[PDB]
Amino acid sequence: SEQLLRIDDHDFSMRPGFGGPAIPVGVDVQVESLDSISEVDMDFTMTLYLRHYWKDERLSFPSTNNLSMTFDGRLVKKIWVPDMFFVHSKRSFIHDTTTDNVMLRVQPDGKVLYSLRVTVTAMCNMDFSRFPLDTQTCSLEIESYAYTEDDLMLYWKKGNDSLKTDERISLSQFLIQEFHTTTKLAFYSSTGWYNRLYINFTLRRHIFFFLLQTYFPATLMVMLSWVSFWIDRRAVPARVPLGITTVLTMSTIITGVNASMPRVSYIKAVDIYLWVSFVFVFLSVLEYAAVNYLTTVQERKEQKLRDTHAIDKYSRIIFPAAYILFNLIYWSIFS
Amino acid sequence: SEQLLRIDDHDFSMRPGFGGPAIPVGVDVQVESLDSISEVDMDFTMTLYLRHYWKDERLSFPSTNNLSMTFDGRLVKKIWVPDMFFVHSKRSFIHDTTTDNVMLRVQPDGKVLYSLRVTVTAMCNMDFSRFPLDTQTCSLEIESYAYTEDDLMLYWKKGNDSLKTDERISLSQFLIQEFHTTTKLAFYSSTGWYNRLYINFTLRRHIFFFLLQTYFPATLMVMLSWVSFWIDRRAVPARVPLGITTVLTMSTIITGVNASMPRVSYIKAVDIYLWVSFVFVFLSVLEYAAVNYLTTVQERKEQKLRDTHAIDKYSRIIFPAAYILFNLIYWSIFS
Amino acid sequence: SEQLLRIDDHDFSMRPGFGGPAIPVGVDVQVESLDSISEVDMDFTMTLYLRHYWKDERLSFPSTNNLSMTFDGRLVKKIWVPDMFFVHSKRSFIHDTTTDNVMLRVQPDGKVLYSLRVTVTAMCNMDFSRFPLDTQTCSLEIESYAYTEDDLMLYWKKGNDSLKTDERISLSQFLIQEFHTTTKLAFYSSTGWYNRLYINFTLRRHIFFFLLQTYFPATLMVMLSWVSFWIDRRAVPARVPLGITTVLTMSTIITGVNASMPRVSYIKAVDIYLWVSFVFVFLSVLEYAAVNYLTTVQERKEQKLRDTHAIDKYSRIIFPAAYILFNLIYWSIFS
Amino acid sequence: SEQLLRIDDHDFSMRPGFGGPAIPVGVDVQVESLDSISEVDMDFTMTLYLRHYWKDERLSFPSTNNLSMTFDGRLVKKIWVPDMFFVHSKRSFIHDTTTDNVMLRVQPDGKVLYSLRVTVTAMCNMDFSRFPLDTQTCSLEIESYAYTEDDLMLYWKKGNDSLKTDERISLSQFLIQEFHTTTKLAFYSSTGWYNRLYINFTLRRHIFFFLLQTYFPATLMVMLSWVSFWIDRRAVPARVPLGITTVLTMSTIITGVNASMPRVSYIKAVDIYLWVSFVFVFLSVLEYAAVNYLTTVQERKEQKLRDTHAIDKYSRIIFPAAYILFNLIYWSIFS
Amino acid sequence: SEQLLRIDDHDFSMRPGFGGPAIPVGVDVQVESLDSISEVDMDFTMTLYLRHYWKDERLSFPSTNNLSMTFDGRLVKKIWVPDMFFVHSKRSFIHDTTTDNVMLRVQPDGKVLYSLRVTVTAMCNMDFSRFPLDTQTCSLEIESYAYTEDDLMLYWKKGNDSLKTDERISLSQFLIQEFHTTTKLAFYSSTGWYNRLYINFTLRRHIFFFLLQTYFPATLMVMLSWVSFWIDRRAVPARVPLGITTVLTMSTIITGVNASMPRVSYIKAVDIYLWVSFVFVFLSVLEYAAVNYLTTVQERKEQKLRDTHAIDKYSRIIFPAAYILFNLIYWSIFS
Ligand SMILES: *[C@@H]1O[C@H](CO)[C@@H](O)[C@H](O)[C@H]1NC(C)=O
Ligand SMILES: *[C@@H]1O[C@H](CO)[C@@H](O)[C@H](O)[C@H]1NC(C)=O
Ligand SMILES: *[C@@H]1O[C@H](CO)[C@@H](O)[C@H](O)[C@H]1NC(C)=O
Ligand SMILES: *[C@@H]1O[C@H](CO)[C@@H](O)[C@H](O)[C@H]1NC(C)=O
Ligand SMILES: *[C@@H]1O[C@H](CO)[C@@H](O)[C@H](O)[C@H]1NC(C)=O
Ligand SMILES: CCCCCCCCCC
Ligand SMILES: CCCCCCCCCC
Ligand SMILES: CCCCCCCCCC
Ligand SMILES: CCCCCCCCCC
Ligand SMILES: CCCCCCCCCC
Ligand SMILES: CCCCCCCC
Ligand SMILES: CCCCCCCC
Ligand SMILES: CCCCCCCC
Ligand SMILES: CCCCCCCC
Ligand SMILES: CCCCCCCC
Ligand SMILES: CCCCCCCC
Ligand SMILES: CCCCCCCC
Ligand SMILES: CCCCCCCC
Ligand SMILES: CCCCCCCC
Ligand SMILES: CCCCCCCC
Ligand SMILES: CCCCCCCC
Ligand SMILES: CCCCCCCC
Ligand SMILES: CCCCCCCC
Ligand SMILES: NCc1cc(=O)[nH]o1
Ligand SMILES: NCc1cc(=O)[nH]o1
Ligand SMILES: NCc1cc(=O)[nH]o1
Ligand SMILES: NCc1cc(=O)[nH]o1
Ligand SMILES: NCc1cc(=O)[nH]o1
Ligand SMILES: CCCCCC
Ligand SMILES: CCCCCC
Ligand SMILES: CCCCCC
Ligand SMILES: CCCCCC
Numbered sequence A, B, C, D, E: 001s002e003q004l005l006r007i008d009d010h011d012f013s014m015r016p017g018f019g020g021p022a023i024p025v026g027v028d029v030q031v032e033s034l035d036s037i038s039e040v041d042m043d044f045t046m047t048l049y050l051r052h053y054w055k056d057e058r059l060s061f062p063s064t065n066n067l068s069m070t071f072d073g074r075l076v077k078k079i080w081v082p083d084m085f086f087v088h089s090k091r092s093f094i095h096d097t098t099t100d101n102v103m104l105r106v107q108p109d110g111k112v113l114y115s116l117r118v119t120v121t122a123m124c125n126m127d128f129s130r131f132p133l134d135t136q137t138c139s140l141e142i143e144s145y146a147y148t149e150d151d152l153m154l155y156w157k158k159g160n161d162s163l164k165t166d167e168r169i170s171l172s173q174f175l176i177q178e179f180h181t182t183t184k185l186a187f188y189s190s191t192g193w194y195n196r197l198y199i200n201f202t203l204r205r206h207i208f209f210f211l212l213q214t215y216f217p218a219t220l221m222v223m224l225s226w227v228s229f230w231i232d233r234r235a236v237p238a239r240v241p242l243g244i245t246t247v248l249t250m251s252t253i254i255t256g257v258n259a260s261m262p263r264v265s266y267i268k269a270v271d272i273y274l275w276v277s278f279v280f281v282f283l284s285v286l287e288y289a290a291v292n293y294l295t296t297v298q299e300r301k302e303q304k305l306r307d308t309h310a311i312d313k314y315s316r317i318i319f320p321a322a323y324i325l326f327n328l329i330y331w332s333i334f335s
């Protein structure tokens, strides 16, 4: 097999058509699965099959039929192959169990198919301002390293049909949709122009889970503090312990939520809702202090000279009305 | 040993019977142990022995007896060997201590046995909707990379007897059972058809542990709030602190359970039970508020004009009846 | 040095005495240190020196004295060496700083000493039913990969004296003792019989630490709830808050203990003790509810017609007696 | 391509101009992205493109035009290349997917361009005394390993214009600014002098996030304890539970904050503020004890012989005044 | 450069002076930085420069001046080099970015300088009985692997001046001091005697941080329980809730401290102080139970027949005196 191909009779350190027009190379991609996603480091891991198509007359061999030959990764070190690399990637490797996952198929006229299986991790900027209602977009980029557009031309072989996805791809806490491909030209100041390929998709969260865990407990505790407005003001040993204990219960809820969320160090949409509810509970404690002080002053004044309080009556209306107004404004901005 | 075999006289870059019928290859598998399982990344790790059987007349050597020769991993780089790989795997490697774990045995007539020891990690989709009563199924897949069904034929050498398991295989938090093997054909649009092999097993949890840790504390606290229905309504400084403190105790239990469970971001069966019990505790606090307000109004009305309350009597019956009805419906759906 | 030994004149791909009796190989082991132990994955890491002894007449060289030659790891790739591997191991590697840790010493008559330094991680099944009083046993296994008992014979060179241990070996949370060696034969259905070597040791915990952290706080809280049996029954605002707060304190202790212990998902000995104490605290709360209800009924009955309660007197005796009986049964079973 | 260049006719183990003046080498750097930063281990990870420029007459080839040739990483092992390394680095590696990310361009007159893509992790000393208002500075260093200033001269090719940064570089919890380059000479006692290059940048935090999470809850609880100064002193069952519960609430806040912050084991600016507020809450509990004791003594004295207390009046003024004074001093020192 | 040195004319598999006296080798060490320290696994990571000095007449080359030649890591595989390795090390590696960090300098008369940059992790036994006042000592060991003292002699080239340290070496939570070097002979039963080198240093903690976080909160809570001794005994709804809540507050502090400290599973100095304070709080709760019971009995006895209690008076003196005595004994033992 190494004698039909003129391996030793040709210099394979130079691209086909050296000194002439650029050689076109086609790319096909099949996505196998998505492994994991990190919200702190802002990256994702993908596994895929990568295929290349090009023609090289130096690899032609005589044959009485159209039967193509198949080779392994050992022949790759001798023949010339493209050097595509993934831009903005953090780490990547090629599987080698039980051997290198590389195949080569050579047509009698010199057409070559080159395929390999590779896992790549790529960075992706994310914005958590609208958490947990945020929507994230990611992209993967493929580009030639050493050859500019004047020497190598890169394109999708079959347009938008060149991308295939496994039917079983899924994520534990995200929903994946809208796979499509695009192309663009990249420029480097000290090297020149390059062709670049893109693979795009979108991610979404499960809204209903976060509503039950975070928004639901907060609302109940706020409504629970409104009970004290209906208890008799003369029961000092009852009104005071109820108010302070509700603040303690709210504090533990906020602390627990922060520990479960990722260590994102800036204000998010969920943080605004929780701390506003904390202020409402705090204001209810000061409300009884005014009632107690005024009642004591009035009783002492009558003794020196010798029914529901007005504050309680209005608090029963103002407090529920203010909280509903806050919800309408909050949900109108954050959809 | 390298001269009895015609290593230099044959081209080993081509499969035996090139240009003719497909060469059949048999596979035997022995499972050694299961290392770990991840519920967040949805993958498992397995260690096993992999063996191949095929015939190659080019490796025949003259011998006066049936004594077969044994070689090492150094000879593998010269002779032709199958290229089986594990589909949907994330990472894998071959052990090399103190040397490569590869053996070769060649019969005088050219029959070859090839064995190696390899550890492989494979993905597995899991559903946690019925946690902690869920049951999970996993599979491992073996397939040829470069050779289609027209060139290489893959099958189990001895049918269902080709799979062996160690007697000491176990998991810390799962029960393993139902090992069996199956086969199926896989199709690739741009390459063709391939034979694929499967190894299947099932996993189960320990039910009684989760009942004690999660379901048991929740039931006791709900029954504890029903005590307030039997205390005298005139003891305002006693009824109110009891109600609010029970809500605080329930909140800490729910927070602790979430931290221990894996970060699965959707509603599970256990979450439904815990939050329904929280509502029952919340409703008991509002029940006393109605009793206290009505009692105060009645006393003031009598003074202006100049025994167990009905709500308490019915609450002693309705609340226990409602909770039992919930349990019957809940346990009938989730088995 | 490469010319006194007939490296190029002999075929080193075959074991000495090919076609004849099995070649005996001796093994010496010196344990350097134990690195770590994992209770969730059930494995341990060990570092050791491994030495081999065998005779090969093909490596003899003429010498006027008994001065043996010393070589490095480069000569290993040429001469034949044993292929011992560690069974049931998860991962292992050979150190290479600043170079490969391999030595070779060849006697004039052909005796060869082969030594290397290797770190190996091996699995070990553990049972935590009797935690924290459990005792664990571990073993390490060494076996030849490719050569059966008919071709290679493996044995300890000096019996039980072949195992040496460093004087400074220790673990942070375990006690190591009882190092000894044993041998056994292993059988493989498709390959044959093999000789196997074993290294055994035992591990124990520090009992007194767990008693102070877990058992000590639980006992104090149970005894603390018995105080309410001596307080006047007329102090309703005192008896009720004391009972409910003790339940809250007990709940936080149980939650904290679970977080510190490893994620072992089945019932252990410690879990039984903690939850039984929780029931004792729960029963004390219901005890006062019966006293309060009966007192209220009696007072109302006397009014309609126109001293320590018996329950409190017996509770002072029954509750302390029941808890002591539980301790005697619990400690008699779990030693 | 390997015959136009006199690879076999020259000794490439010696630098160009051996025995003569030092060869000047230029460096260009383009920063791609920052991956992560660790506050416990005090290091950061950076990915960048590194380029070298030098002239070597031994690589000249005849050509009728100015068309330069392009090669791959295979030619690097034959020709002489600079040996730049990153000082104070912990770990680094060169990407190799799908092949080595190395390019070579050779001009007809012998000018050589050498480029590679590398990820490097470097240490950086940090001071957390002024947390969370601290500002950190980092640097990256490049130096030749084996060749001193007498043999190799290292400099920026285009001065301060040699550094380029990606437009999308960002960090999750830090702000990056002030990229600039500097140079300095380094001296080694046993080897000599070396040229060193520097890349500098500055990092800042998000101030407003930490104020809401830490400073905001602490202030509210302190103001909440001042309420007890306005409640009637005769309500013993109300004043005492309010005071002790506030201490409990403050303790949980401090514990939660420590768990979220990195394990920095020395006093920081934030720790001072939290513990001073704890003392203010503690002092309020002792204040009521003095009032209660004095009131009891006065009442007993009057009985034996047969209005707001002064302490409460002053506490309403002294306590708010003292806390405001603390804030002015605290914020004047820590800006 | 490969022809002035007689690489092919000499057998470099044997040490210089084979069959004669031992060859002396000198070592110089410069410490660059300390990366991290682990208190659970008991190991530390260090990065350093290692240099060797020896003479080999086989590498002499003719020269008209004293100009020494410089080489790279490629020549190392041909010439003979020492095989120093780090004893008791867990893992180590040599940096290779952008190339191997190895240099060679050969004098005309055959003197050779060999330098390399390596990162090594070594074990270190630690004792935490006196935490957080403990002091730890660490050591690093260098030894020849294959050559005994009869063939290779190892020594510091310049005595105690051979060790250099970077001015910027620091740790986040430890203080490093007292760098010095020592030497000792090591014996192996089956191999012989070896020379060993040592590098020693000492580590200390920041005392004041742990006092504020652990000792300070514990003392305040104990003093807080002494307040109840000054409140009127007739206020049953005040004395009882104060006592039980203090126990709850103390329990949360102890749980939080354990989570922050490393998982060291034996009794430490800090644990003794915390649990003794817990007993003091527990005893105060039982003290009021005796007062309440005796008061009730006396009142009932007077009714049947028809002022500060003594226990409270003594408790005001005995309790403060006992705690001060404990501190004097505790701090006298643990310095
Ligand atoms: C591929 O299909 C997607 C579908 O959204 C479309 O947006 C995109 O433009 C298509 N690409 C090409 C190259 O036609
Ligand atoms: C192997 O045995 C299992 C037992 O469950 C059976 O389901 C399966 O069909 C068998 N496979 C073959 C190939 O007979
Ligand atoms: C080695 O000594 C141990 C000591 O416990 C003993 O049990 C074991 O049998 C001995 N082994 C041999 C091979 O004598
Ligand atoms: C590069 O620009 C920065 C801008 O801050 C300046 O400080 C620095 O000195 C400049 N360097 C040189 C070499 O001019
Ligand atoms: C090196 O100096 C240290 C300083 O503490 C001293 O203890 C040690 O003995 C010295 N070593 C030698 C070899 O002189
Ligand atoms: C008390 C909770 C009130 C919630 C009001 C929600 C209004 C949503 C409008 C879009
Ligand atoms: C108060 C707990 C009642 C539990 C009822 C369980 C019924 C199970 C029916 C299958
Ligand atoms: C209240 C604690 C009683 C403990 C009794 C222990 C008995 C141990 C018998 C072996
Ligand atoms: C009660 C909070 C008072 C805060 C005062 C802040 C003063 C800032 C001066 C720079
Ligand atoms: C209430 C705290 C008393 C502390 C006494 C410390 C004495 C230290 C003597 C060395
Ligand atoms: C499944 C319960 C959702 C509750 C949402 C409450 C939003 C205010
Ligand atoms: C802390 C509450 C003070 C209330 C004062 C009311 C004066 C009208
Ligand atoms: C927040 C409630 C204020 C009510 C004021 C009533 C004045 C008469
Ligand atoms: C081992 C106790 C199990 C309790 C189950 C309770 C289910 C309602
Ligand atoms: C918050 C409880 C209000 C109860 C009102 C009862 C009216 C019948
Ligand atoms: C949830 C209990 C309701 C009881 C209503 C009784 C009306 C007389
Ligand atoms: C929940 C406690 C009820 C007590 C009833 C007692 C009847 C004898
Ligand atoms: C658990 C204590 C029961 C006491 C019953 C006394 C009946 C007179
Ligand atoms: C966004 C609220 C900031 C509050 C700062 C308080 C500083 C005393
Ligand atoms: C613990 C508080 C004691 C208060 C004593 C007051 C003496 C003037
Ligand atoms: C901290 C308040 C002290 C007030 C003292 C008043 C003395 C008359
Ligand atoms: C649990 C406290 C009992 C107190 C009894 C006192 C007898 C003198
Ligand atoms: C721990 C205080 C004991 C006081 C005893 C007093 C006896 C008269
Ligand atoms: N094709 C990417 C690239 C990097 C570089 O330095 N020149 O080109
Ligand atoms: N046999 C698997 C496979 C991948 C590919 O691209 N062609 O075949
Ligand atoms: N010696 C172990 C082994 C594995 C195998 O397949 N045959 O032998
Ligand atoms: N150029 C760095 C270095 C290290 C050394 O030992 N000599 O030089
Ligand atoms: N120099 C260390 C060593 C190990 C061994 O087995 N012989 O020597
Ligand atoms: C926050 C309510 C205060 C009311 C004072 C009249
Ligand atoms: C939730 C019970 C309310 C009863 C009102 C009559
Ligand atoms: C659990 C004790 C109940 C007693 C009822 C008489
Ligand atoms: C801390 C305030 C004490 C006041 C005593 C008169």
Ligand SMILES: CCCCCC
Binding pocket: E283, E286, E287, E290, E311
């Ligand atoms: C712990 C104090 C008990 C006192 C009994 C007289």
